[PDB]
Amino acid sequence: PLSHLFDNNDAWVKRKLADDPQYFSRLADQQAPEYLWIGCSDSRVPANQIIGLPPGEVFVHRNIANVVVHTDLNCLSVIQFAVDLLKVKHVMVVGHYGCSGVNAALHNRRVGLADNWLHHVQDVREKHAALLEDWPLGEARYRRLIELNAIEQVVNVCRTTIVNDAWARGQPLTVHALVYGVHDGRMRNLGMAVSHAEQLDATYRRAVAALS
Amino acid sequence: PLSHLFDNNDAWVKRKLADDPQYFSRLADQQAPEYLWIGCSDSRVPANQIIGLPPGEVFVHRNIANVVVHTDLNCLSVIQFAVDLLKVKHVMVVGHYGCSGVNAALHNRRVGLADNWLHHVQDVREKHAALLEDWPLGEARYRRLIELNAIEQVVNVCRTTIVNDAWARGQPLTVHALVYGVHDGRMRNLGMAVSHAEQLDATYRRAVAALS
Amino acid sequence: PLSHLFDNNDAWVKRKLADDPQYFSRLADQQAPEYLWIGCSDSRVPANQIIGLPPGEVFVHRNIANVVVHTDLNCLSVIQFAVDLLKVKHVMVVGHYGCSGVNAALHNRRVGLADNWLHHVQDVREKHAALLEDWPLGEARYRRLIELNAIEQVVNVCRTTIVNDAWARGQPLTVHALVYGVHDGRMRNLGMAVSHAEQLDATYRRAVAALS
Amino acid sequence: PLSHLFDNNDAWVKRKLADDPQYFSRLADQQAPEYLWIGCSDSRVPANQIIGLPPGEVFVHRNIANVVVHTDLNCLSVIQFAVDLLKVKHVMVVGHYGCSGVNAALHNRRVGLADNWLHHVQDVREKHAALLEDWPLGEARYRRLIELNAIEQVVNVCRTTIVNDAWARGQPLTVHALVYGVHDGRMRNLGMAVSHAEQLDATYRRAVAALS
Ligand SMILES: [Zn+2]
Ligand SMILES: [Zn+2]
Ligand SMILES: [Zn+2]
Ligand SMILES: [Zn+2]
């Protein structure tokens, strides 16, 4: 009824009802998240779901290609809020196979504004150029890129003042490079989990585990 | 097994299996989203879910308090990508009752870095000061604030070059101010849906609909 | 000689020589700046000069229309660096009559990207709409706008965590709203100099001093 | 007289008078800048001066360490404004020997917020790690760093959509990596002047010209 998004308000009452086991109360009561999930705006599947947890149990940021810019106060804000105030136990940068962002980059594809944003990802391409070479294919490189991208981003988090300060001040925290396949639902561990400024080794290891 | 996040990889195989109706294929095949959802990092409930749609059918950005800064290339990027390249039909700023961001603001609460980010929301508080007055309570103001916040943010989207250009170039697009209760799952329409630079009227109307 | 910018390297040796009173040594020795100048990229006249001081005696940021965004880590960075580490005594937002930025705004003029940035200034226009009304002219409004713009920006600085923390921690600091005419070289005091969170009064006063 | 900055208003009338050759009129009449100068907030000496030109003849941005972030709408704004609307002929990233920013970086020195901003410069350190090695000294590395930093930043400008589009659309434009000594006033050419997407060669050359 000119509702514009009527369909959506219907699919909504539709949803609201299906949850008879009365508990939006459970949700509204949910307590502190213990995780920050930084992921891609290709919200192919939601975080809590993927990882099988109640919603809101995971604190979420999403930008195109799950990029952490040193100077992005959008994300930094999220992080300082998750760490300093929610005392989340774990931050994890989760990339996703077949990401439209990492694609558009890779194949120097003009998009307009966001080209600027994807430069960040082109940088990872540049950074790991030779490595990405010895995978002379397509999907390999791509896979390997969305992987590398997630590791670097993690380096970014770990270099933040927010995080370094938390470690400085004793607060337990660990930061994970992580990827998931939208194809197979499964979630891959890159062995990228820093906990104290031992990044130099933890990452070198993790990046070794490409070596074509 | 020192997995650090073993629990999470388990709850994962747990999830992966439960989806016997073999279709991660369906997902991987999912086509263009027709919606951009900008919401709060208090990811109390996921967008597609709330609104009853397959995941990835909705394109998502999340920052603390679903703020659209004129000059935030984090979000602007998402938007230029959603509009210009995904030709999404609808953008909608969705706030959420009992948002931790809108709270921390409201009650001038020091948090650290993100205080800077929440200033944006304090601004809406300032902007609609007298209005928010004639609700001399607490939860009212709060409710009314998370509402107003979502409208203003929409004004922000609608003022973007990205959007104005899309309209300029004929491309059909509509932008909605929207809120949902985590208490009752239900989703409220603020009557804030701009489609062509007719904001001045569409919003004045929408903001009228507080008038204590 | 294909130098591309030969002219500039010449006008340079030209400059280098004219400074016989050997003292680039004096400069290289110059000590801490005691001022942060935030001004417009319309660098109509340099700060130190205007204000008659040795160069480098003033620490400088320049963006289009001397805008301080709550979440601009470009400027915030400059400020945290000037205050926390250079212990500058004074920060001052200095606008400038006939500013091309404040103009382009004012007369809703499409420019492209920076339209987004100028929205910040349109906001001040919005914020002080009625005030700016009772100046039914052109240049008045403009004058009055570049003025108001500089005050608001100051409110922005004063609201920063950086500044609030400095005051919190006792460190003496004062923040000034200031304008200069490129026409007459002279520099106007807006009576906008906050020193401790007494903004609410100091600014109300300062903004009164328009009252058409 | 409690003026707070009386000294400054005096040194001002002092300046205003000394310019008897009546011409603030000349200035106010000055026409379009044909240059964008991006430099460091260590405003050791002003651009026009250094380069011997009337003020305002050069359009100026200043951030800590003259960093161009892919996603910094503060600077990008300046650039889109300088290029698209002022049709400046030349953009030039000008670093400066003994820069406090490049220093603080280099010697992983905690400063607070701006540490985040300087990460950008640490990145150049990382990027050119081995190169910077074969200069086993201090001031060498430093010199060589403030140099490299200015080249990379230029790569950043040249990768911008703004610039690429200008070239796309025929508009003549050239981008220069440039450094100046505050010690000796002199300005060094790094042979870094791109004019059309021929960066890959122009820069490789320019970076060769370190080779310890
Ligand atoms: Zn993606
Ligand atoms: Zn929220
Ligand atoms: Zn200006
Ligand atoms: Zn410097």
Author numbering:
A (entry chain A), B (entry chain A), C (entry chain A), D (entry chain A): 7 to 218
From the paper:
The genome of B. pseudomallei encodes for β- and γ-CAs. Our group recently reported the catalytic activity and the sulfonamide and anion inhibition profiles of the recombinant β- and γ-CAs from B. pseudomallei, named BpsβCA and BpsγCA, respectively. Besides, the bacterial CAs play a pivotal role in the life cycle and pathogenicity of the microorganism, balancing their endogenous equilibrium between CO2 and HCO3−. BpsβCA was revealed to be a tetrameric type II β-CA with a closed active site in which the zinc is tetrahedrally coordinated to Cys46, Asp48, His102, and Cys105.
Therefore, it was hypothesized that the closed conformation (called T state) observed in the structures of type II β-CAs is an allosteric form of the enzyme and, is the inactive form at pH values below 8.0. However, at pH values larger than 8.3, the closed active site is converted to an open one, with an incoming water molecule replacing the carboxylate moiety of the Asp residue, thus generating the nucleophile required in the catalytic cycle. Finally, to gain information on the open conformation of the enzyme active site, we solved the structure of the enzyme from one crystal obtained in the same crystallization condition, except pH was increased to 8.5, a value at which the enzyme was shown to possess catalytic activity. Although the structure was determined at quite a low resolution (maximum resolution 2.7 Å), we could observe that in the active site, the Asp48 is in the same position as in the structure at pH 7.5, interacting directly with the zinc ion. Nevertheless, the active form was never observed in a β-CA structure, regardless of the crystallization pH, except for in two mutants of H. influenzae CAs and a thiocyanate inhibitor complex of M. tuberculosis CA. The X-ray crystal structure of the enzyme was solved at 2.7 Å resolution and two different pH levels (7.5 and 8.5). The X-ray structure solved at two pH levels (7.5 and 8.5) showed the same “close” conformation at the active site.
